[PDB]
Design a protein around this ligand. Sequence first.
Ligand SMILES: *[C@@H]1O[C@H](CO)[C@@H](O[C@@H]2O[C@H](CO)[C@@H](O[C@H]3O[C@H](CO)[C@@H](O)[C@H](O)[C@@H]3O)[C@H](O)[C@H]2NC(C)=O)[C@H](O)[C@H]1NC(C)=O
Ligand SMILES: *[C@@H]1O[C@H](CO)[C@@H](O[C@@H]2O[C@H](CO)[C@@H](O[C@H]3O[C@H](CO)[C@@H](O)[C@H](O)[C@@H]3O)[C@H](O)[C@H]2NC(C)=O)[C@H](O)[C@H]1NC(C)=O
Ligand SMILES: *[C@@H]1O[C@H](CO)[C@@H](O)[C@H](O)[C@H]1NC(C)=O
Ligand SMILES: *[C@@H]1O[C@H](CO)[C@@H](O)[C@H](O)[C@H]1NC(C)=O
Lengths: 35, 35, 49
Amino acid sequence: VVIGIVNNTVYDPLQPELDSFKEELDKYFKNHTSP
Amino acid sequence: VVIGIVNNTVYDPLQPELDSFKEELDKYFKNHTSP
Amino acid sequence: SGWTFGAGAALQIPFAMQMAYRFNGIGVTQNVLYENQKLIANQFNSAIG
Ligand SMILES: *[C@@H]1O[C@H](CO)[C@@H](O[C@@H]2O[C@H](CO)[C@@H](O[C@H]3O[C@H](CO)[C@@H](O)[C@H](O)[C@@H]3O)[C@H](O)[C@H]2NC(C)=O)[C@H](O)[C@H]1NC(C)=O
Ligand SMILES: *[C@@H]1O[C@H](CO)[C@@H](O[C@@H]2O[C@H](CO)[C@@H](O[C@H]3O[C@H](CO)[C@@H](O)[C@H](O)[C@@H]3O)[C@H](O)[C@H]2NC(C)=O)[C@H](O)[C@H]1NC(C)=O
Ligand SMILES: *[C@@H]1O[C@H](CO)[C@@H](O)[C@H](O)[C@H]1NC(C)=O
Ligand SMILES: *[C@@H]1O[C@H](CO)[C@@H](O)[C@H](O)[C@H]1NC(C)=O
């Protein structure tokens, strides 16, 4: 709809604050393979 | 306290962005029943 | 350059972005310009006529 709009990324600060919590979650599984 | 206030839902965009991360978390447990 | 030549040296801006700054000035969010720009221009062009 918008005349002259341009393509660029928009960053989300909630996303690496979710994703480093995926890496925390995932290390709980990868270690809890062992006990 | 407020005269004429009405009851309605207020949506939280942080909630399904947490809850679809519960469904990701939960599938890690449901599969990691098996190895 | 919109209001900028009044307050200092004239600073260029695209005219549709000047009109967006105006719309925010009257308390209408700038997307209401860009979603309607051809109509807003046709209304202005008709009004000048
Ligand atoms: C801004 O980003 C847009 C999203 O990436 C991009 O849209 C893409 O544009 C090309 C060219 O118009 C499309 O390519 C297809 O073109 C025709 C169908 O119209 C097909 O026959 C071709 O084989 C090819 O698949 C993309 O499909 C289209 N992507 C989307 C999601 O619609 C814009 O072109 C970008 N514009 C600028 C100025 O950066
Ligand atoms: C707006 O939503 C409110 C929350 O759901 C709602 O409050 C509820 O109102 C009823 C009626 O006043 C209460 O029902 C209780 O009434 C008496 C105690 O006052 C008891 O004897 C009854 O058995 C019954 O349990 C609810 O307890 C009350 N809920 C809360 C959390 O306080 C408003 O009525 C709604 N108002 C409008 C206009 O939509
Ligand atoms: C692995 O799990 C044990 C508990 O069984 C814990 O003490 C240890 O810190 C964990 N190590 C890693 C690398 O997560
Ligand atoms: C289940 O776990 C294995 C790794 O042991 C993985 O490769 C596979 O993609 C997982 N499948 C599902 C449905 O999560």
